[PDB]
Amino acid sequence: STHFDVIVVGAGSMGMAAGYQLAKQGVKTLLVDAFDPPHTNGSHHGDTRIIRHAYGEGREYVPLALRSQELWYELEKETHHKIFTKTGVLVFGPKGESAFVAETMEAAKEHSLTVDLLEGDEINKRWPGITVPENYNAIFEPNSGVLFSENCIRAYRELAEARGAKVLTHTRVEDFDISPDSVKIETANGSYTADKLIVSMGAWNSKLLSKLNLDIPLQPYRQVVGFFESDESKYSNDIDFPGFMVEVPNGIYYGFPSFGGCGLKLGYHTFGQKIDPDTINREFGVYPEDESNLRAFLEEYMPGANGELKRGAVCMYTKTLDEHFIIDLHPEHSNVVIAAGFSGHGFKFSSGVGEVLSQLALTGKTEHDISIFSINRPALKESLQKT
């Protein structure tokens, strides 16, 4: 019975940000989510998320990283929820043996980002609690840091709803019916129509995009993290222990300083179980790798934080073949915007993506350069399920 200007399916990290940007402009928006964001069934829980500017995944992400940072500061001033803490972000690895470290330094140089460069014992000297080999080098970004992801989504939601946005919770979208001049969604709670559609279902994009005649390789991964009882005199944000993302022989790890004594949080990025969001086991510890992969890191590089496991969380990445995002219009429907495959590193950009999605939905174009996120790029292996 009711139409909308724009309908956002999946009101999570990207969708809720888009909802806020749309509502902010008086655009009558309906956001539909299978749950009640923020929640623990998607990819945004775990309390915290790292934001980096000097981007090791590729220096082309910097502009979006910087715009997103400015938007996070703006959100901080608009809500009572805590949004960002400037812990700084440390990146280290074996000298000359880390592509991630190399690209980070290059990204820094190329965009004139403020960073500190140090090696070996200088790393251990500066940050009691971190022990790396003499052959290790590092780049520290003082001004990037940590975002409180659940708070971000919560704030964007409260703000969007206050502006008129409608949020239909616990309602899973089951199908799509797209037309030349309108879009329609089917749910158990009723059907809804609008002029434009934004699709941002996270891990579920790998299962439901086929409903839009899109055949794109997207693989969901089970990715856990653990909070460990740590030596507060070394790992507390209060004593300036930084957030970090590093690359050692067996891969890439990321962590957060202890906030208010919650313990240092650590996650292993490189490995994760291939899963389906509908059958994934969300209990931490069911796989021996969950806790063992983390402690193996701590015992070697941050021994003082290898205490009791205080809490474990299970979350998901949705990877593309090239690990770059998908942000573009549906190849056959200019009134349909797709946001998918953030491959484990998209939260920091959610504020900026919200803006991009808003622009694409309203005008079919964006001021941002998102060519590398094209849904038609060859490295993606995208195609229609039947042309």
Ligand SMILES: *Cc1cc2c(cc1C)nc1c(=O)[nH]c(=O)nc-1n2C[C@H](O)[C@H](O)[C@H](O)COP(=O)(O)OP(=O)(O)OC[C@H]1O[C@@H](n2cnc3c(N)ncnc32)[C@H](O)[C@@H]1O
């Ligand atoms: C998992 C993970 C990810 C992660 C990270 C640590 C872990 C353990 N650390 C990060 C970090 O330090 N820095 C960073 O920049 N990113 C980091 N990430 C990745 C980031 O969290 C993800 O890229 C991000 O959350 C992706 O956002 P997206 O918006 O894609 O996913 P979501 O937040 O899960 O939202 C999807 C929503 O859509 C809903 N949904 C799903 N299916 C439906 C249907 N059928 N109908 C309606 N709604 C649907 C979900 O309920 C969800 O809310």
Ligand SMILES: [Cl-]
């Ligand atoms: Cl997490």
Ligand SMILES: [Cl-]
């Ligand atoms: Cl992801």
